[PDB]
Assembly symmetry: C2
Homo-oligomer: 305 residues x 2
């Protein structure tokens, strides 16, 4: 009963969060086995950030220039490395709090939990989506940098995101845990175009299914539609095109609710065309696109870890 | 930058969550030092739930009738007790994962984090508010019962909520950790009136301050107003009355933004009167009342634990 934006439990990530200080710069790092991961821009002065040569900057640094704190512990570095936009600090001590973990590159539209940190200390947890334009709309103050995004499958934390940048426009960009940026972004203080964001059509449909499951059904129309005709309306309202992969992924919600995907699509179209008339769906006056069909199923079936 | 519904990090509560099975009934329990806390209705059959005599039901039970699991561990009970609507199971093993903790009874309008669990296993975390009518709008499937709400001040987890009931109306009710219900509710399957909910006026104002801080200022009107005149409009729109305690609590947001509380109140009134004209504030087309002035300050100043 009820439907909330729900984060994964954060304990297994909390015990991996370290404070990283190189020269003056201090931000969050991820301590897994014998390696601390952090944004490579920790080696930058505000002046460096304007036009950084990371290769050159990293050279004027050695192992002993990096202060990695875990609470009141102080760790020791024995091998530093730059993988794309992440700094890998090889330390002597394996994190005894290290969970089963993988690094994953997620797709636009997918969701993850962010454990937001300041000085390697957890402040809070929230759910977000990789936007279609590879930004995220998060909550990040100075020093939040190196905060990580993750999913939990079973026993296994899947790290998918590290926060690097706020864009002049207020939205966020960062990397996978191999330090490849999501999107066209670079770790440099220069104007960077996010580009046109679209609504994650498959997520809005997931959420409409969620609404039906929790008794919110006012928007089910007698009409139906076709994929081509729906995608005509979708393109007008900067909704991502819907594919058969999308219809397939919604199959189980279709089966639980007895509502054909294309029927739900005809409901969505009327909503895109007529707006909401000032009514609400699951407490919201706008169409929500930050739940996956997987998230909706997890919350509705009570999956645990 | 940005503004998200943010939960407290959940690790310190995760290692306190146990599975409680009496007879057939299984739900979540809170293992602190040598005591497991759970809804006393775990001793009820679906039939019992209609008209339970808890005193009598608890008597046909003894220590060895209660199966408390922590993961794959199995705990042993040496003293059972009923405090109001909570069952206290005295076990032999102190939880070595026990944080610094207090039990607090929170006030209507205050927020907390819920760690939602099924079979004593964490599934997810989310932020909610005690509604003015002492319900909560959460996400709780069967077996979620005994899921706890909490705040973290510094090192210290403040437990304020245990989930007991879904009401026929889909909203949730439960207790403090001394087992006193929030609101008029009883742990019995009978029709129970929540009563009229109001909007938490002080929280909506907090959130308007949050919006100003993140550059969302379209709603600041040239007008101002008075407390009496504002509370006239408030009562019309089932907003809680605003008191001088409320104005005082907003003082620091007033000072950070250079916007007098009563001025922000005049903005709120125009919004209550004219609606939103289809515009949004911090991504929302409705007025948000589940952030406290404290939450807004914590997210905007980057407080950690």
């Amino acid at each position: 009963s009820g439907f909330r934006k729900m984060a994964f439990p954060s304990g297994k990530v909390e015990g991996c969060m370290v404070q990283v200080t190189c020269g003056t710069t201090t931000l969050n790092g991820l301590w897994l086995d014998d390696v601390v991961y952090c944004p490579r821009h920790v080696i930058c002065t505000s002046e460096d950030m304007l036009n950084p040569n990371y290769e050159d900057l990293l050279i004027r640094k050695s192992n002993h220039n990096f202060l990695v704190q875990a609470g009141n512990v102080q760790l020791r570095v024995i091998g530093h490395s730059m993988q794309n936009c992440v700094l890998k600090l090889k330390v002597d001590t394996a994190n005894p709090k290290t969970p089963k973990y993988k690094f994953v590159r997620i797709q636009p539209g997918q969701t993850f939990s962010v454990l937001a940190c300041y000085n390697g200390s957890p402040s809070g947890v929230y759910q977000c989506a990789m936007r279609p334009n590879f930004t995220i709309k998060g909550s990040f103050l100075n020093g939040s940098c190196g905060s990580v995004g993750f999913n939990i499958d079973y026993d296994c934390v899947s790290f998918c995101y590290m926060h690097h940048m706020v864009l002049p426009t207020g939205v966020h960009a960062g990397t996978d845990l191999e330090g490849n940026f999501y999107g066209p972004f670079v770790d440099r203080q220069t104007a960077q175009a996010a580009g046109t964001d679209t609504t994650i059509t498959v997520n809005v449909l997931a959420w409409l299914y969620a609404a039906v499951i929790n008794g919110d059904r006012w928007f089910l129309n007698r009409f139906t539609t076709t994929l081509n005709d729906f995608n005509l309306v979708a393109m007008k309202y900067n909704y991502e095109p819907l594919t058969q992969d999308h219809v397939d992924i919604l199959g189980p919600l279709s089966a639980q609710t007895g509502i054909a995907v294309l029927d739900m699509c005809a409901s969505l179209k009327e909503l895109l065309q007529n707006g909401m008339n000032g009514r609400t769906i699951l407490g919201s006056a706008l169409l929500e696109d930050e739940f996956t069909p997987f998230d909706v199923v997890r919350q509705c079936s009570g999956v645990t870890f």
